[PDB]
Design a protein around this ligand. Structure first.
Ligand code: MG
Length: 289
């Protein structure tokens, strides 16, 4: 995962291998190399700085300068720091008896596909999901979700053009009652960029529907821009967790590695969609697969 970063971290660590004890300047050099590798992978500057300080403190705590196999001590330390940067421990949203979640994000994030994949994931766990195609301006966005629902075997309520949030609420409620739906996944409007009309409509929909989770879907390939998108969605709408898509196309990793620090939000899922496992990703970056 994250090809360029992975190669650079592995090389930085491997440079230390089979050479016996290393010097302080050797360690500092290695840290500077890791820092540059993170920077080049579009990790947020402060995240990268904190990461290497963490590694250094942890490595020195493990007596790296006395070690006869310092590369292994570095490897361990970097693994942990990666784990932590990525979220520490696997996290998922809390289901209750009934749940109504928003998916938010830019057109291009994979939001709509993600909504359908999440519905399938939770159907496999025994929930009874309902997809809601909530774009009140674009019939094609609603049709997209309708087709995906048919593919995954999950019902889809399509909002009407210009439908009020209150009417959406009523129709969703009705359908959920008639169909015993217990997980309502609202695919909100996707647009190419953030603007005030979008935000205001999302914020209003949120006031009226009262979602228990707001999942922000981000194309990881956008790098740091994703986290600026995240901050904007959080400030203007309010997010509870992230879904990162297109991780397999991301050679860099900066968004994943920076999200916890920058946004304070968990990465729930990774995009054909699985719960996000920070430890697995940390291993993959380091070549343990
Ligand atoms: Mg308000």
């Amino acid at each position: 995962m994250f090809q360029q970063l992975s190669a650079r971290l592995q090389e930085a660590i491997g440079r230390l291998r089979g050479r016996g004890r290393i010097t302080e300047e050797d360690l500092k050099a290695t840290l500077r190399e890791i820092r540059r590798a993170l920077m080049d992978a579009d990790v947020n500057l402060e995240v990268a700085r904190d990461f290497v300080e963490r590694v250094r403190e942890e490595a020195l705590g493990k007596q790296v300068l006395e070690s006869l196999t310092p590369a292994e001590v570095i490897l361990a330390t970097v693994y942990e720091a990666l784990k932590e940067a990525l979220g520490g421990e696997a996290r998922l949203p809390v289901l209750k008896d009934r749940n109504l979640w928003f998916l938010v994000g830019l057109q291009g994030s994979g939001k709509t596909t993600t909504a359908a994949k999440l519905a399938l994931y939770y159907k496999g766990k025994g929930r009874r999901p309902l997809l809601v195609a909530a774009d009140t301006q674009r019939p094609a966005a609603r049709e997209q979700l309708r087709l995906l629902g048919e593919k995954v075997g999950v019902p889809v309520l399509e909002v009407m053009d210009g439908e009020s949030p209150e009417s959406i609420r009523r129709r969703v409620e009705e359908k959920a009652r008639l169909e015993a739906r217990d997980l309502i996944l609202v695919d909100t409007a996707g647009r190419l960029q953030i603007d005030e009309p979008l935000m205001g409509e999302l914020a209003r929909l949120k006031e009226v529907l009262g979602p228990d989770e707001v999942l922000l879907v981000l194309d990881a390939m956008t790098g740091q821009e994703a986290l600026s998108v995240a901050r904007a969605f959080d400030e203007k709408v309010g997010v509870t967790g992230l879904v990162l898509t297109k991780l397999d196309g991301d050679a860099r990793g900066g968004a994943a590695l920076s999200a916890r620090h920058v946004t304070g939000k968990p990465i729930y899922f990774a995009g054909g969609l699985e719960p996000f496992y920070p430890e697995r990703l940390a291993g993959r970056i380091l070549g343990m697969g």
